[PDB]
A paper describes a structure:
Ub is a small protein comprising 76 amino acid residues, which can be enzymatically connected to various proteins, including other Ub molecules, through (iso)peptide linkages, giving rise to biological messages, so-called “Ub codes”, which are read out by specific Ub-interacting proteins.
We found that the hydrophobic Ub-Ub interaction in diUb was reinforced by cysteine substitution of Lys48 of the distal Ub unit because of interaction between the cysteinyl thiol group and the C-terminal segment of the proximal Ub unit. We chose cysteine as a replacement for the Lys48 residue following the previous studies. In this crystal structure, the thiol group of Cys48 of the distal Ub unit is in spatial proximity to the residues from the proximal Ub unit, including Leu71, Leu73, and Gly76, implying that atomic contacts of the thiol group with the C-terminal segment of the proximal Ub unit stabilizes the closed conformation.
Numbering used by the authors:
A (entry chain B), B (entry chain A): 1 to 76
Write the structure that this text describes.
């Protein structure tokens, strides 16, 4: 299924995901496409930060859902 | 100075802050106004999560800047 991943800075990523994908697996897909290390990524749905070991299914993420991506950078 | 704090769910909070305020002190102001515990709050500027012990000055937060607020909820 297609989901959108949007930064708060004006970039939309489209991903093909499975409902059984963990949030960490989605971060790996974002690294594959955009080169951002999973350790720096924080994914958000419905205003809440998502936990790495839960699945898209666990969070009721449906086709065409939008996740937001923000970074946790150690340097800044 | 005035800043905006916006959720990703359609709520804008206006705060009066000082540039020497820590990010934790801003979370305390959000708790005072909205009743959200600081421990659940994550504040974001320019697509990056902000660190509790740094100041608005440290992050170049200017008058009329917008921070985003997301929650880290242990249960959901």
């Amino acid at each position: 299924m297609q989901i959108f991943v949007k930064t708060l800075t004006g970039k939309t990523i489209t991903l093909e995901v499975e409902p059984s994908d963990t949030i960490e697996n989605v971060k790996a897909k974002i690294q594959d496409k955009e080169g951002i290390p999973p350790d720096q990524q924080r994914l958000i749905f419905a205003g809440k930060q998502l936990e790495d070991g839960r699945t898209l299914s666990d969070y009721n993420i449906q086709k065409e859902s939008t996740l937001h991506l923000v970074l946790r950078l150690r340097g800044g």
